Each structure stands twice: as C-alpha cells, then as structure tokens.
Amino acid sequence: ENQKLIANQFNSAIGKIQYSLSSTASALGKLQDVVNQNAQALNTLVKQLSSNFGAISSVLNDILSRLDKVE
Amino acid sequence: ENQKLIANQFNSAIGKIQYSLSSTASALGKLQDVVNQNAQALNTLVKQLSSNFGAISSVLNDILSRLDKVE
Amino acid sequence: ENQKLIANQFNSAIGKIQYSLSSTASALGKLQDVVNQNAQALNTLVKQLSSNFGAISSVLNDILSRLDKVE
Amino acid sequence: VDLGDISGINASVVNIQKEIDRLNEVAKNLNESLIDL
Amino acid sequence: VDLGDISGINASVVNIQKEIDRLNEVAKNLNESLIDL
Amino acid sequence: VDLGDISGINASVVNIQKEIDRLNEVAKNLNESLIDL
C-alpha cells in the first residue's frame, strides 16, 4: 500500500518534470530563435550603415571638392 | 524503514527540483525581459536612423541644388 | 524487491534530471553570454553612430556656412 | 543621392511567458507529489 | 572628412541546440524511469 | 541642420548568473538525494 503510494507519487512527479523539461526546451528554442534573429538584424544594420556612410562620405567629398573649386 | 528512507529522499529531491524550476523560470523571465528591451532598442535605433538619413538626404540634396545653381 | 525497483528507478530519474539541469545551466549561460555580447555591440554601435552624426553635422554646417558665404 | 533604406530591419520579440507560467505551475504542483506515509 | 568605421561591430549568434536536444531526450527518456510495480 | 540624438538608446545587460549557479548547485546536490538501501 505504501509502495503503491510511493510509485504513484513518483510517476506523477516524473510526469510533471517531463512537462517542465518540455516547457524549458520550448522556451530555450524560442529564445535562441529570437536572439539569432536580432543578431542577424544588427549585422544587416551594420552592413547597411557602413554602405550608407560610404555613400555619405563620397558625396561630402565631392561637395567639398566642388567648393574648393568654386572658392 | 526503507520506505521512510525512500520517502525522505524523494521529498528532498522534489524540493531541490522545485528550487531548480523556480530558478529556471526566473532566469527565463530575465532573459525574456532583456531580449525584448534590446529588441525595442534596435527598433527605436532603426527608426531614428531612418529619420536621420532622411534629414541628411534632404540637406545634401539642397546643398547639391545650391551648387548646381552656383556653378 | 519492489523497494530495489523503486530505488533503481528513482536513482535513474535523478541522474537524468541532473543531466537536464546541467544542460539547462549550460544553455542559460550561453544565452547570457550572447545576449550580453549583442548588447555591448548595440551600445558600441550607438556610441560610434553618435560620433559619426556629430562629424556629419559639423561637416554639413561648415558646408552650409561656405555656401552662405559664396552665395 | 539615394541613401539605402534600412526601415525594413526589424527586431523580433520573444514571448515565452506561457513556458515560464508552466514552469512555475509545475514548481507549485510538485508539492502535490510529495510522499506522506 | 573621415567617418568612423563601424564595420567591426559584429553580433554573435547562439547555438544551444545541443542542450535543447538533451532536454527533449531526457523528457522522453524519463518514461523509462517510471515505476511499474 | 540638427540631426536627431540617438545617444539615449541603450541596451540592457542580463545577469542570470545567480540562477545558473543555483541550477549547477542543485545538479550537484541531487547526489545527496540518491537512495542507498
């Protein structure tokens, strides 16, 4: 009787721990996906910003050359 | 006697696993909060950078128009 | 005999739960490291972008002053 | 002068509140699995 | 006019797929630890 | 020409080292809960 109680309580606890481990795995997977998406976002932004400052630098240099010519 | 030992060890293990599950929940909550704050930061930065490149483009276009006029 | 079975199953379950807790700790540590690296990346990018818009603003102001002088 | 458009760069948000709630629910329910001989 | 270079600012990626796989493997293997008297 | 100020955009840091330490501590302490008949 006490053995049946121990077995039932242990099986219930193992079921709940399985539920918790599946929840933790799902949460870690979602966090991994989001962190990696934000990392790709930051890297894309850094690349585009480098291109844009390249463009701005080229344009500003052309403008400064034109001003040096005019004045 | 062996049943009391099994019950005590099982209750100790379930207490420790409860402690670990609360720790995991707290850690996942903190990670969620920080990841979401950094995502909002990246989105705010992208919006402000779009506004700033809009301003820079408008100003550079005005400057190029003025130069085309002068020269 | 049933007590030996309960003890063996409980020890197996505790070993598996130890494995799972070590895995969760490793995963949370890796997520913490990556989230903090990306946060430092975003902060470095914000600082450098502030410096770069400072430079661009200074240069554009000099250019506008030169144009006001020429025209 | 056409600067590249970066407005499409979006940062996702994570919603693991269901899983945190399940973890806390299990950490509370495991008291119903304690053995009282 | 030399704008600062930001090309070095890189964002790391996380690969905890091994740990998620271990967690799911344990959540499946714990059925082999259930007591059947 | 006044470009917008982005210096306020800050990225938080996470410090879950206490929880990782608790998890490793429990994974080590669960050996004291093994049954030795």
Author numbering:
A (entry chain B), B (entry chain A), C (entry chain C): 918 to 988
D (entry chain D), E (entry chain E), F (entry chain F): 1164 to 1200
Provide the authors' own sentences about this structure as they appear in the paper.
We determined single-particle cryo-EM structures of the five selected single mutants and the Omicron triple mutant of HR1HR2 using the same molecular scaffold (NpDps4) and data processing workflow as for the EM structure of the wild-type HR1HR2 bundle. For example, the D936Y mutation causes a large conformational change of the side chain of HR2 residue R1185, while the S940F mutation results in disappearance of side-chain density for R1185, suggesting disorder of this side chain. Thus, in both cases, the salt bridge between D936 and R1185 is disrupted by the respective variant mutants. This salt bridge disruption is associated with decreased cell–cell fusion activities for the D936Y and S940F mutants (65.8% and 24.6%, respectively, relative to that of the wild type). We observed various effects on neighboring residues for the D936Y, S940F, V1176F, A942S, and the Omicron triple mutant. These structural effects correlate with changes in fusion activities for these mutants —the D936Y and S940F mutations result in a loss of a salt bridge along with a decrease in fusion activity, the V1176F mutation on HR2 slightly displaces Q957 on HR1 along with a decrease in fusion activity, and the A942S mutation introduces an additional hydrogen bond along with an increase in fusion activity. The fusion activities of the D936Y, L938F, and V1176F mutations are ∼60% of that of wild type, while the fusion activity of the S940F mutant is ∼25% of that of wild type. Overall, none of the five single and the Omicron triple mutations dramatically altered the architecture of the HR1HR2 bundle, as indicated by the small RMSDs between the wild-type and the mutant structures.
In each case, the process of viral membrane fusion is mediated by the trimeric viral spike glycoprotein (S) that is cleaved into S1 and S2 subunits by multiple host proteases upon infection. Two heptad repeat regions, HR1 and HR2, distant from each other in the prefusion S, drive membrane fusion by assembly into a six-helix bundle. This HR1HR2 bundle formation is thought to provide the energy for membrane fusion and is therefore a target for therapeutics, as exemplified by peptide inhibitors that disrupt infection by the HIV-1 (19, 20), SARS-CoV, MERS-CoV, SARS-CoV-2 (23–25), human parainfluenza virus 3 (26), and respiratory syncytial virus. We therefore designed a scaffold to efficiently determine structures of the postfusion HR1HR2 bundle and its mutants to near-atomic resolution by single-particle cryo-EM.
